[PDB]
Amino acid sequence: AFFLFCSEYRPKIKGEHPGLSIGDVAKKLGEMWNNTADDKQPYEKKAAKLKEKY
DNA sequence: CGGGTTTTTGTTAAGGGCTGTATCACTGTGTAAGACAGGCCAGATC
Asked: What induces it?
């Protein structure tokens, strides 16, 4: 949920207000994503689709 | 043999400072013997 959600919301969250380091940026953003599945499922669905396609 | 534990295993993803090889430009020189082949020739011989 949160992994695919961060890999999806990368553009705006990384080009609007990143933070101190890429580490802390993606950490806080993945936390917010996991605390949003209820609103991030299709990103994980696309991830699993690519995984099956591989 | 196996569902669910037993302690784990990728993995794979989003960017960033440190390390470890791979390049990059750039320079040191015309010899030294030996074998064989023609060409020239300067005395040998009839």
From this structure: (Microbial infection) Protein levels increase upon infection by human coronavirus SARS-CoV-2.
